A = this chain, B = another copy of it.
C-alpha cells in the first residue's frame, strides 16, 4: 500500500484542496489510497486491499508515530534498504519488488530517510548515489573483473528520470511551453488523461509552481531559521500556485538561499531532505506534515508523466545546457571507484537535422567525453581547450583504450514519423527528410575523415508500423559506402498480431544490409510465447490489408518446409491469392509464386520503380529488374505502390481471428527465424527486464529473455542458440542503471528459477559479454 500512498493523483487532488487545519482526513486518505490501487492494480482483490491497509495503520500505531511522509518513508527504510559492506544496499530477496516499486516512487526521499534514521557505518559520509542496487560478491567480482558492456544508451536528455524532475524546477515556464506544444497532440493528451483525467496545462503549471514553492518553504525549515511569518495565511495549499500570497497586502517572496548555490542538484536535494527529516525525527507539525505529501505526490506524479511521455515523442528543455549532460552521464556511467566498471558504452543520440546544430551537438558530446577523460587520465593534451570538434579528435586520438575507462561509440538513431500521401509512394515525405538527414550525417564524415572512428553505426528507432523495414534499405546501403561500418534496426512492439510481428523481423533480415556482426534491437516478437501473448486479448484482431497479405505470404514461405504443419502453408497460399485479387483489382489470375516474387522485390526504391553516391544506388536498385526478365512482378509492384485504388485498399483494415494458427505452428515461425538469426549471426539488444510497456507478464518470471538464455521449462526444444546483449534504453523506471538491470537478471535466476550463483552468473555473463563481442567500437 506504500506504492499507492506515494503515487496517486486522487490523493494529490484531495489533499491540496483541503485546508491545513482539519486533522480528521484519516478516512479521506483511506478511501483515496484504496481507489488508487483499484485504478492501478485492478486484479488485486478488495478484501486483501482492506487488510493490507489495516495492517499499515496498525503498524504505524505500534511504532508510536504520526501517519505521514516521515511515516511511510521510515517504513520503507527498514523493509527494503539495509546497510552492507559497500554502504547502503538492498536485500537480495526483496530487490525484485523494490524494482517494481521504483517505477512509481522515487528513491531520493527513501534514500535520505534511510541515512537519517539508520546511519551509515563509522559515521561515514553519504552523498547522492546511483540507483541503489543489491550486493552479492559473485556479481560484484565479475563486474570488477570484466566491466559491463552497453549497446543502447540514449545520450539525449538527463541521465535518468530522477534529476530530470529537478530540471523542471529550474525553468517551469520552459517546461510548460514545451508541454503545451505536445498538448495539442492527441497522444500526449491521451497519455496525460490516463494518469489523471483532470490534467490541464493551467493546473499543470499550478502544480509545478506549487512543487517549487513547497521546496522553498521546507528548505527554510531545514535551515533552522524561523519562518518568514506569512505562514499564518497558509490555510489552503492551492495558494502556492502563484508564488505570492496577500497577507496584509505586502510583498512576499518565496525565493530562499540554500547552503550551496546550485539548489537544483542531487547534492542540494539530498542535503535538504536529510536535514528536514532530522528535524522531524521524533515529531512533526501536522500542517507541514501534510505539505510534504503534496511535494512527494507531485514529484512522483510528474515522473510517471515524464517517463511515459518519453515513449511517444522524441526541444528548448533539452537545450538548457546541451553539453554538461553528457559529462554527467559519463560520470554516472563509471560509478564510484578506480575502475569504471563499464567498458564499452554505445551512446545513441538523436540527429538534429541542422548542420550548424548538428556540428555543435556532436562537438558537445565528444568535448564532454574529453572532459570526462581528463579527471581520471593523466597525460599531456595537445589542445587544453579545443572549443571545436576538429581539435577534440586531436586530443582524443592520443588516448588509447586500456579497459579502465568508458569507451564510446556514437550511433545516431533515425526517427520515423507518420506517412504522408502522394508523391509516387506513401512513405516519401518521411523519406525526403531522412534523405536530407543523411547529408547532415555524411558531410561531416567526408569533411573530417577522422570522425569516422567514433560514429560507428546508425539506427532507425521509432517504431515498426511507422515505416516498413525495406524503406531504410536506400539509406543504410548508401551509408555503407560512407564508412558507417555498422547498422542496427530497432523493431517496434506495435505488431497487431504475433504472427505479423515475426514477419517484420524476417523482412528486416532479407532486405536490410545487415552483414555479419550487425545488431537488431528489441526483438520481442521472436521471444514471447504465444500462450503468454494471448493473455487478455480479444478473440478477433485487426490490421491493414498490406500487413495480412504480407503475413500470409510470410506464412507460406516458412511453413511449407516442414513435413508437417504444411496444411497451414497450403491454406495460407489459398487465402493469399484471395486477398491479392481483392487488392490489386486484377482480372487475370495471380499465382502464389508470383506474389512471393513481387513482394521479394520490395527492397527497391519506388523512384526507380517507374523505369554521387545516391544516384549510383538509385540506378543500382533499377538494374536488377532491368537485367533479369522479371518484368511482370515489376508491373505488379508498380501497381502495388503507385496505384491510388491499390493504395487505398492497403490502408483498409481486415478482421483476423486471434487463434488463426495453433501454438505449435506459431512457435515454428519463431524457431525458423531463430535459425535465420544464427545463420546471419545477428545479435539482439534485449530491453531491460523491468519494462511495463509489454504489460503481458504478470511477473518478471515470464519475461521472454529467460527463454533466450535456455533455462529448463521456459525454453522449448528447437530454439536455436541466440546472441543476446543487454541495453538500458527504455527502462520505464525512475532511476535506472545497467548494473541494476544486471542484478535484476541475476536475482530472478537465482531465487525464483532455482539456480546456483555460479551457474546464474554464467548465463548472465555470456549475455553481458556479447556486448563486447558485437560492439561497434573500432578494433
Interface residues in chain A, defined as those with a beta carbon under 8 Å from any beta carbon in chain B:
1, 10, 27, 31, 34-35, 38-39, 41-45, 47-48, 51-52, 54-55, 58-59, 86, 94, 97, 136-138, 140-141, 144, 186, 189-190, 193-194, 197, 337, 465, 493-496, 535-539, 541-543, 560-561, 563-564, 566-567, 570, 573-574, 577-578, 581-582, 585-594, 596-597, 628-632, 652-655, 678, 681, 694-696, 698-699, 721, 756-758, 772-775, 779
Assuming A45-B695, A629-B582, A632-B589, is B653 touching A58 (CB within 8 A)? yes
User: A27-B186, A55-B542, A535-B698 known; 7 other A-B pairs, CB under 8 Å?
Assistant: A1-B538, A45-B494, A48-B538, A51-B542, A54-B653, A563-B563, A589-B590
20 sampled A-B residue pairs with Cβ under 8 A: A1-B538, A10-B197, A35-B197, A42-B695, A45-B694, A47-B493, A51-B543, A51-B653, A52-B542, A137-B773, A144-B779, A560-B567, A561-B566, A566-B566, A582-B629, A585-B629, A587-B631, A588-B589, A589-B591, A678-B756
B contact residues around A140 at 8 Å (CB): 779
Most buried by B among A48, A97, A694: A48
Nearest B residue to A336, CB-CB: B779
Most buried by B among A563, A594, A653: A653
B contact residues around A655 at 8 Å (CB): 55
B contact residues around A773 at 8 Å (CB): 137-138, 141
Q: Do B137 and A541 touch across chains, with their CB atoms under 8 A apart?
A: no
Q: Do A566 and B563 touch across chains, with their CB atoms under 8 A apart?
A: yes
Nearest B residue to A693, CB-CB: B45
B contact residues around A52 at 8 Å (CB): 538, 541-542
Assuming A593-B592, A681-B757, is B47 touching A698 (CB within 8 A)? no
Q: Do B681 and A47 touch across chains, with their CB atoms under 8 A apart?
A: no
Q: Please measure, in the bound complex, the distance between the C-alpha atom of A678 and the C-alpha atom of B760, giving whole angstroms.
A: 14
Q: Please measure, in the bound complex, the distance between the C-alpha atom of A581 and the C-alpha atom of B593, giving whole angstroms.
A: 12
Q: Do A593 and B564 touch across chains, with their CB atoms under 8 A apart?
A: no
B contact residues around A43 at 8 Å (CB): 535-536, 695-696
B contact residues around A48 at 8 Å (CB): 496, 537-538, 541-542
Q: Do B541 and A756 touch across chains, with their CB atoms under 8 A apart?
A: no
B contact residues around A590 at 8 Å (CB): 589
B contact residues around A141 at 8 Å (CB): 772-773, 775
Assuming A97-B539, A137-B774, is B560 touching A566 (CB within 8 A)? yes
Q: Do A589 and B589 touch across chains, with their CB atoms under 8 A apart?
A: yes
B contact residues around A543 at 8 Å (CB): 51
B contact residues around A337 at 8 Å (CB): 779
B contact residues around A35 at 8 Å (CB): 190, 193-194, 197
Nearest B residue to A566, CB-CB: B563
B contact residues around A578 at 8 Å (CB): 597, 629
Nearest B residue to A649, CB-CB: B629
Nearest B residue to A678, CB-CB: B756
B contact residues around A190 at 8 Å (CB): 31, 34-35
